[model samples]
Target: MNTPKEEFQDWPIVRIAAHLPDLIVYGHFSPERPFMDYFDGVLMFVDISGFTAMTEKFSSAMYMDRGAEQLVEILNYHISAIVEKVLIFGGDILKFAGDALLALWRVERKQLKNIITVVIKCSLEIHGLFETDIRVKIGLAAGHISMLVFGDETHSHFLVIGQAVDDVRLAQNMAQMNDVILSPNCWQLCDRSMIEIESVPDQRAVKVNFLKPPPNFNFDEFFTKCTTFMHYYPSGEHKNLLRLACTLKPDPELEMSLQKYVMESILKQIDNKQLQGYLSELRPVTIVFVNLMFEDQDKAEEIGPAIQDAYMHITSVLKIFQGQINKVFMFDKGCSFLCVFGFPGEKVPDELTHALECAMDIFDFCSQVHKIQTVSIGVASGIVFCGIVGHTVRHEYTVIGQKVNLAARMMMYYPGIVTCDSVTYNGSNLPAYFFKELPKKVMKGVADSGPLYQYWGRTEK
Candidate 1:
């Protein structure tokens, strides 16, 4: 048997990259072409309900650090079950949005019927796996989607945007507990024998209720065919993909080259602990949401270049402060960047103050970038579930809490301005002149319609 160090050395690096989306890995291997693709496909969104209360219960009591292990145990077990079902049906998981997951299956027009049948069955199996114990809402949609790779070599991201994606989200929003909903696009292709549909008069989606057991479909052969699904590139490109053979001997060049695909922080974590397991803890942290918008034109030509410029400047400022970006969401109007201060394993004393300063600095950078006409920022401070979530195949370091939602909601209030929730206002040490109080008009979802503040600008002492 191999020694402990020998067995764990190069394997972990390969495993980390495995969790990344296939398109991202494909982009890393095939540098000859631009990393973007438009293909017809079906998409599924599975949203887990009641996780917040579960997390709250686990983290609030005497459980503390150990409770995180239990929380993640349940989270991972459920996610793994869903991941397995999707994979067996030849579906590709795009990303896990907090407690929700997005999956895709690229298909040819002629084979749409067979593909949709398989996906529907996969959904039912996932629900059947949970039974009535875990409450889940699933949404299915079918159409064309655009997947693109963004950012520079060291820190790149995958973004899926299209009408199909929008439909999937809408369907997910329409679903109630233990319900499966389908967008009109997906419903048009469903096999009626497998499900009964309920049409709501005003909604764009229809609810799917089970009428009969899953229909006959051969998934084993499909799994065999799936071995060739995501490998549509040139045959010679396979040589560039990272392999164990390249990393086994500890080549400095190979290790350094791999840094472009994985983050430096993650590398540091693995080296510090041989292998990072699922660990979580409840901590008071500050969250910032910055949304970039174009007031002039929605044209792709101008928006793409300007957003890249804005991202460069924003990342520089974040580096200067002790802030890290957790997620970046792409939408029709613009992009949303989620940054966190005082993340896990941090001991920053003035994180709230730093978070406020960072947001203002980002606002300044946004003003300088052309076509980035609006910079709406929201900052809030509260306890959050901060840790790495997911199993070996797909996982991400993310923050989830009502405060996270509050930050996103605050970002929507005023364009080209910075907004702060009450908790952040009380926690920060910024002077009074740096803030302007907002009225109750913006307090619909807030607790007890508490006071809200808007950051005006910094002034000399």
Candidate 2:
């Protein structure tokens, strides 16, 4: 569709795979479905061949329980690659079926020629996603899609029921790895010069090998240049990433002409209403410090990722308990994480219960990682002087208090236990849970006399 840089395709298909689990995440429903009249559309099904076999290959010996999580990451890599191209060319990702992707390019009747060209180009580039081991096969069909709206628009979707849908499915089912097959209806409409078309005497389907790339198509160089800009720009990470998106590499090779048009679209806000240490306030908080130290530089270099992975695995657990990472220090001695359960002025639970639970989860996960043989966690709950810090150009919140230091010291005293002070244990009623108290002892960086208690928390078992 000679779609000008101004308009967007009205109903850009499913809330699945691309973003949300349902329309609920957007806080809206079927009534708000951006309605559109019946129009000509192109459908493409793209899938990675033998993707299940690939995942199953890693399910043995070493993978074990962790195999499912690693498998999800691999599938995400492939899905994001193809889905990115669909959105780039003004197409809609209708849904994802396991290892497969379904995309739709909707346009007015007058734009059929352009739609065919656009869809073809996108499918060919979907192959570029498989630079190494995977191979993507695609099928295309063109037809009219009627809106099937029921009550409340419930159980709703634009039902594309016709010969076109059937033909496309049949064609794609027969396509080999690394190929694009098209229904006869789609083939006759596409630009013949861009592909080698073939058809049997009695069949209503055709197989095509796509070889057309816009005049100067180099996928590697394009994304590389975009990435280099993101890393080396003085505008900072967010700003540079927006700047990198300036060249998203549109099909039909309209990049040079549209470069100036899109270059002015980058957003790097100054975000000036920043706070400071001068505005610091004394607030009660729960501080959790997670520590992982290596015996030597060799172990640090070799096993650092296992510890980091363990940290990431517990982020959802923290979120459920209203805890967040305050800071991370990757110094030569070791890596330490400062997790704050109660942000400055936040209305989270003041009892420090969430922090202790989060710490226990981290201890359990890291203890099981063969790559990282040891880890420690310490928590402290008390008043802390917390506020925003940093220069005018960049300002963020920070905590400065004896408790913050105490939390770190507790980790050093005992590895693997969620150690804390007497005040926190009493405050959180940790005595009611699975907890234990340690002997009275002195602590570093503190002149006070107190016992540094450790939360047994399944560690005793």
Candidate 3:
């Protein structure tokens, strides 16, 4: 069989086999029946030699427990190495049996010999890791096997049965302690040029007296590449980290708006009206806002119950924020929700840009979850009136600023509805690859023909 690209393709069949005996056997009365069709390949097993004698040597319950634990520890390490080797060679480890393990390979006949040699080398390494007397016996056979799937809602079993399975088991039992054995079928599938065999005088038995050396496996290089790819083109962390950084720096206009709301709240409690002048002298602070939109209202509703759950999961996975999150608000609009990043402070050159980029990260999350075809975003930052603005009967804290108006207009007139303002895209020092420059145009409600920039997420240049 050809190498599979997806890991799911190699998933073990235990869910349908091991625990669901009734599904494979017609009635609970007969539990040995098979229910699936057959496929051609190799079946391999490894058993810990002298396990029964070890049990006899340590007859006490405590000794048994200790022995079992030690055996498991050794077996786990060997099995882990074996599984890694299998995956590296495009094969799969099927299951483990306390002191043994089962594996399968569907490589072409030419590759099969190489695979068997590698497995033998791996087994030798594992054997050397344990005590001098402790050893492993490996058995291998290749041929057609029957596969059957039988089950209902309550029970199921997908089984493989045939002479191939029986022969492999017999080979395992016949193998000498600390040695490997191969069936005739397996030897035929392997490259004869690299192998030397000895025949018994009776002409009924053969042994691999000489075996080829195993190929080099560069595990470190393989894992290093995987780690690097995940970090840069992250399926999760990189984007969340960027989002958290942006949240720490909000746009100047949004900051002022939040401050105004706070100041008015303070003024309502104070009797002295003259002290209000002191609030006006404060510097404009930048507050970051992130608005994430799902594909539709139904999706929005579906995610509502887990809004905090998602936030917690992201934060736990990417530890970026130090200060308290200002707010995380979700709306029923099929496409968007709002997030505020900075508050109670003045404008910083980099805050708005980070907030915008963070917004883009949130959009990326949506894209991954729903394969979002498009996302729209707008940002504005500037100083505006941030004190008491309402009448005495119902005074409220708010920023009545032009920047806010411009931001809202930008959101409305975004050519592709994905445009971010100049202060956000340019000020943030974001990579040029993350955005595309669109034709400059005069926004409907804002003054000046600001150059429009669309969020492109991240793309290779």
Candidate 4:
């Protein structure tokens, strides 16, 4: 479907000049707006004790990067069975992220006080059976939570959004090992005469605070040395006598022979702490994917400077949006460009809007101004594991997320439109009437076919 030039000439905005009686309380658009459950319920945040320290130790001493997946197994090893019983015992699961699990028991046909009974029962049952190392700590709170969940469109896997979730999270953080702590609300509601709960007391004497780095610490050398066996051997246990190396290298510059020796020394020596600066972290990012197609399907070559012309225009437009082009992929049918906005050093307040501006800017110039043809754009934002990723011999900053795949899919599946995923559509705080809501699209990879929107240009005021 070819978009006409007149489509961009004067984008007609919804001229609602005479409307003031409408409800103005509707807040920002989010995935939570639809399946949101406005309920007064009890939520529990169950956390596995010492999971973080164990992971850092695993990364540093034992498995290193080789145990990345194995670390997940360890987390799941203690979490899975108990979580699986939530439905069996009748409480609802709100969300589970990292080491925290949020479960809810709605005040349905039961009494308001019955909510407290449900939570305490579940926690005791989960903590009922445990191995020596698999410790379970829980916190409970009763309050109103706008619980809504969906396939990973914007945030965590099935995110629970509201103040209640926050209360339970902090309460659980204060819980001691094998301790089940309760918030004021939970304590006030529970019939104390009926149930008994643990109240562990803290030592009053010790008041220690962290100051600075250790006396003999060189994180840079340890960080570089961590990648030693990564290039040579991607997986294995490490040690001093042997080139015991775990194959997760941040930089691949180390030579194989010397690299083997370096890992030997690094692994042999214990308690050598590495700074977290080099590791990948989960963060938010926005991607503006540009796709250019040609009529000649079988011919993989560029369409005689047409593709080059597209690249020239795209590079110029992306400069103004505070973004960088990450990759340029050319296929037999077409070519695609991934322009990234908002990295660690430079984060944007409204990343989705930033990406939309880049796409629209390029589209306006290429189609209406530059006279370039057969191109489409897609923009999306979500959490991604971002950092230097590659062989230790050579590494570059890269991101891996579902939103990246969804953005590119929009460009391929829906042509001749400036497309944005549900996140971008809901996030952009611009004129409401400028973008056209397309029929909800079912793209590959995205579980929920979101409210996909197509933008041509800003509406003429």
Candidate 5:
């Protein structure tokens, strides 16, 4: 039986691809659609340092107006440069997490060494793009990876899982500014003379020596090979898709109308007609970071169903409190979700209390998940840039400010607990019994402030 199709089916694929990773785009557009694929490849994570501190510095000097523009321009510049190198080296740009990017280079077992060589040189080339002012830290690992896409045409989520994903993150964590760190597997495949041994106490990661000469690489052959995925399109079919995406003068009316699908908030607090006036704004909001953790990295690959279930539960709880998910940065074992309350022109009288209560509810739901080892919740309150970010082609709604960084930093301090910055605790009107003052602990990337607090739970008035 044939069912009626929705208008979303007619939306341009290029516009949809703008919001997803290249692998997801390829899978969605291909006929041999499995919605999931397992492959061996090199996963690399490049994280830019000093963005938070720079934003804080700019705001303190009363330059946020011009500074925000400057920062975004610089970020886009760096991302463009890095993306060029990643593509030239036959890698797929998987996803972006704030100032960091995750890319993969698919390869067969026999050609693993060759791909590793190309990736290392690629990383080095990318490293050369930035200097001491705006430094970069890179993490690389080669192994089997699981790339899974979930959801339908109207909305979707993707998960990239593997021990390599975990290892690459750990490697980046161990890297210093302007350093390129490689996991044990990637390190073993490198030319010994090209890389020197380095010490990393926490993980078996090593920093690459940039001064050494990289291995010689070829160009046209590999470039053509990697670009062949489009061949999956039946003869001349891809041409039609391209004509629909590129040749047709884009319909501005349709593009604006379709934004509802790309927009993160499904809560619809504001009328669809009000979208134009509500592009971006600086609002005083409560930020909550929900970080899911898994006990064993080995079991992370099978986390597709568990993560979907947890996401469904989290979103339901979020909607009850008028909270909107700004972004969900996924990884091997878990994901970091940024949720904002009191945004998109909606005003909640007691937003802080609602945010805390929401966290407590999230904790209750998370505790029921057997696969989740711990869920770290970090809450903070402050004025933040809340609105659509990125250029006309690709973008998302994100909250950016010193407080956003503080919440993320706070999450790492404690696991299986709910922690909040002093600002959040002070602004919250919840009774004192709901919170306990915590001992002062220094958090990296956050300016030193008053003691932190832990949210115990809700109390009946």
Candidate 6:
């Protein structure tokens, strides 16, 4: 039976590299090439030092061989973990350099910082493994990189040729034992405050070396950026653009521009007023269920005029009430309409009863329209279930649930009567209100029946 160590020993690093097409080799001395040359993304490199000397000191081939293999395994594990973290933050892994892993990030600026922080945390955890002089150094750089695949039949590799890759290599070389170095670009993309930095002495003949911070970067920027981007580009081919946006974090002007573009793009895809209204409902606001019923089916012919009059009155009332009920919907066969009072991306009452008072004026309009005597009205308010339903090919955003059904039933049972659910009635706190108890009536096709009530309008408090 193979032990855990035996199984681990059998795992081949080269074979693993072969499986990742994005990874390529440069010179034999460098296990992996610069990944950014072939992919425009964040690149990271990790190096394990003192491996050669350790191999020579430990002449026992098994020990040295196992040590190398273990180090490779550790690197593979860390690379996989970091790659997964990047993807979760809306980025991806382009390639892995032997011993040192090169990764790409296509995430928001905030989340890019988080991904880097996570990479650092993972590196710290890795520090526990190297007990001897052999330690690891991590370098990170973020920017546009020139990526291309080169080589013929003899050999092929994903080559990253760009200043970003150079920055990463230099950063890695500058990093001390068990240290993580981030370029200025990365610092700008990620939360600088979250990381602790130590300036290297000028004697090194380098600009500056920033040591990893105390793992303070909360990844909040990354989460926020990712979420904001997803809200705009849920699914599309604009991945490159989204990634670019992420890297340019802390730029409110750019963010606003991106947000506006995303909103406009999504709105353009939606042509129907009802769908737009539904999307608008995604925001919080009052929903006015305007129920209009004529005495008979023939009276329905006057709907167009009735709608105009009702809309005029409702808009006037809204202006006075200082509310936002902009949309109105009507059923094809039913003598009823629904008016929604809210704005997209804002909050309003789900069950707005104060707005329902306008229904009383609707009755006044009916009286003005000669020959129209009694019109039934039902108003129910609550968080109505609204969303696109059905298979992907055919879907629609419409309201549903007991609130809608109950309101319809109330209108049908008591013609010329204006009724509302307990939520609307109580929420509005209408004084001197009266309700008449109704016997349990099983609606057609429905198996259950509940006691019904009719609203007799508000009374003096």
332-399: candidate 3 lDDT, tens digit per residue:
22222222333334223456555665555554554455334444455555443333222221122333
lDDT of 3: 0.43
Taken over the whole model, the C-alpha lDDT of each candidate is 0.68, 0.54, 0.43, 0.52, 0.66, 0.45
Largest TM-score belongs to which candidate?
A: 1
Error of 1 at 251 (Å): 10
Q: Which candidate order results from sorting by lDDT in descending order?
A: 1, 5, 2, 4, 6, 3
Quote the positional error of residue 433 for candidate 3 in Å.
87
Deviation (Å) of 319 in candidate 2: 28
CA lDDT of 162 in candidate 4? 48
CA RMSD of each candidate after superposition: 5.3, 21.2, 30.7, 25.1, 6.7, 29.4
- Please give the lDDT score at residue 88 for candidate 2: 53
Better model by TM-score, 2 or 3? 2
- My TM-score estimates for the predictions, one after another, are 0.82, 0.40, 0.36, 0.40, 0.79, 0.34
Top-lDDT candidate index: 1
- Predicted structure 6, TM vs. truth: 0.34
Model 1 misplaced regions, further than 4 Å: 1-10, 28-35, 189-195, 211-261, 272-279, 294-303, 331-333, 344-347, 413-416, 441-450, 459-461
How many pairs collide in each candidate, listed in order? Answer: 0, 0, 20, 6, 0, 23
Candidate 4 collision pairs: 230-247, 238-244, 240-268, 251-392, 252-392, 252-393
What's the alpha carbon RMSD for model 6? 29.4
CA shift of 174, model 3, Å = 1.9
> Candidate 6 on 1-461: residue-level lDDT in tens?
85553122111222122223222211122222111222334666766333312322332456543433343334334444444444444433443322344555544444555556555554455554554645667777776555433222222233344556667777777777777677767666665655566655652212223434554544456455445533323235445332222222234432222222122212333423234323412123344445554443233234334444544565566545554432232222233544444434334443355556666666556556643445666665544433322212112233333444556556666566666555666566555345555566656322342444456556532
Predicted structure 1: lDDT? 0.68
